[PDB]
């Protein structure tokens, strides 16, 4: 149904995160012994290594065009990286408890976080002040992303529910700054992640229910589409295939699934006999995908 082709492989200690760079043939690993990897998936090198966290780093992703990155740790920081000049150039200090996801934002100087301490934070990068702390989550937020086009975010949180926040007013200043638009109810256990769909109205958010749901959206209402059944165990991370009309989802069942978009019927699972999958992520351009897993990161394409 498909084929796993697998280009590069680490083998390490437990993997959380994988972020692709968008020009360069690199991804940055983050590792729950703290330390960061820079690596080469065409050549298998291991160009560098960050070592600025205590404790498991969960957030890990790479401005789109500055020489930046940034990592989000359990010790509650989220650090800012130039990856030329190699050094740590600073601390966002706030979070109260874990950071689970950090990223930038595509235009403006903001990265987004959020956090076991139950908000969501958005900071600018060039001033390093916190311009605003999204509140309204009760449990963890384990997920939040910035829409692609819109002043939206979408978070995913351990009290079952999935928001959409409208960012509209922290945009137009360059709390009215976010407003809550919808609380996405459907999860009966904890959300671990959400994710949009790069260019269509689409939602995706997966859980400790084992379920991968689909959400479609307009300017003014949001509606449940449907439900991927199947895997057994939690499902850690959930993503949308950029060019195909596929859904890709991973889990603690030691699977990597792929769904249909339009029937939601499985297409292909990937199995690992030991190793429990934590995050997966595709390259903004490439069809080209990473999974990160309790053995280490792997890089692969689907045919």
Same mark, same amino acid.
């Given at each position: 149904?498909?084929?796993?082709?697998?280009? %590069?492989?680490?083998?390490?200690?437990?993997?959380?995160?994988?972020?692709?760079?968008?020009?360069?043939?690199?991804?940055?690993?983050?590792?729950?012994?703290?330390?960061?990897?820079?690596?080469?998936?065409?050549?298998?090198?291991?160009?560098?290594?960050?070592?600025?966290?205590?404790?498991?780093?969960?957030?890990?992703?790479?401005?789109?065009?500055?020489?930046? %990155?940034?990592?989000?740790?359990?010790?509650?920081?989220?650090? $800012?990286?130039?990856?030329?000049?190699?050094?740590?150039?600073?601390?966002?200090?706030?979070?109260?408890?874990?950071?689970?996801?950090?990223?930038?934002? #595509? &235009?403006?100087?903001?990265?987004?976080?959020?956090?076991?301490?139950?908000?969501?934070?958005?900071?600018?990068?060039?001033?390093?002040?916190?311009?605003?702390?999204?509140?309204?989550?009760? #449990?963890?937020?384990?997920?939040?992303?910035?829409?692609?086009?819109?002043?939206?975010?979408?978070?995913?949180?351990?009290?079952?529910?999935?928001?959409?926040?409208?960012?509209?007013?922290?945009?137009?200043?360059?709390?009215?700054?976010?407003?809550?638009?919808?609380?996405?109810?459907?999860?009966?256990?904890?959300?671990?992640?959400?994710?949009?769909?790069?260019?269509?109205?689409?939602?995706?958010?997966?859980?400790?229910?084992?379920?991968?749901?689909?959400?479609?959206?307009?300017?003014?209402?949001?509606?449940?589409?449907?439900?991927?059944?199947?895997?057994?165990?939690? $499902?850690?991370?959930?993503?949308?295939?950029?060019?195909?009309?596929?859904?890709?989802?991973?889990? &603690?069942?030691?699977?990597?699934?792929?769904?249909?978009?339009?029937?939601?019927?499985?297409?292909?699972?990937?199995?690992?006999?030991?190793?429990?999958?934590?995050?997966?992520?595709?390259?903004?351009?490439?069809?080209?995908?990473?999974?990160?897993?309790?053995?280490?990161?792997? $890089?692969?394409?689907?045919?």
């Amino acid at each position: 149904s498909m084929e796993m082709l697998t280009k %590069f492989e680490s083998r390490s200690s437990r993997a959380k995160g994988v972020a692709f760079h968008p020009t360069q043939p690199w991804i940055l690993t983050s590792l729950h012994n703290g330390r960061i990897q820079l690596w080469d998936y065409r050549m298998g090198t291991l160009l560098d290594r960050f070592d600025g966290h205590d404790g498991p780093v969960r957030g890990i992703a790479f401005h789109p065009t500055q020489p930046l %990155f940034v990592s989000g740790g359990d010790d509650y920081k989220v650090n $800012v990286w130039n990856y030329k000049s190699r050094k740590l150039l600073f601390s966002l200090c706030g979070h109260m408890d874990y950071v689970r996801v950090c990223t930038f934002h #595509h &235009e403006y100087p903001w990265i987004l976080s959020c956090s076991d301490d139950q908000t969501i934070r958005i900071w600018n990068w060039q001033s390093r002040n916190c311009i605003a702390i999204l509140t309204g989550h009760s #449990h963890y937020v384990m997920c939040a992303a910035f829409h692609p086009s819109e002043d939206l975010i979408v978070s995913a949180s351990l009290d079952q529910t999935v928001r959409v926040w409208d960012i509209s007013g922290l945009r137009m200043k360059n709390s009215t700054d976010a407003i809550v638009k919808f609380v996405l109810e459907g999860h009966d256990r904890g959300v671990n992640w959400c994710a949009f769909h790069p260019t269509l109205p689409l939602i995706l958010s997966a859980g400790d229910d084992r379920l991968v749901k689909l959400w479609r959206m307009t300017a003014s209402k949001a509606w449940e589409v449907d439900t991927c059944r199947g895997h057994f165990n939690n $499902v850690s991370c959930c993503l949308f295939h950029p060019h195909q009309e596929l859904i890709l989802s991973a889990s &603690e069942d030691k699977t990597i699934r792929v769904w249909d978009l339009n029937r939601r019927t499985a297409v292909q699972t990937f199995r690992r006999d030991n190793d429990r999958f934590w995050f997966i992520t595709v390259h903004p351009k490439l069809n080209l995908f990473a999974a990160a897993h309790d053995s280490g990161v792997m $890089v692969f394409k689907l045919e």
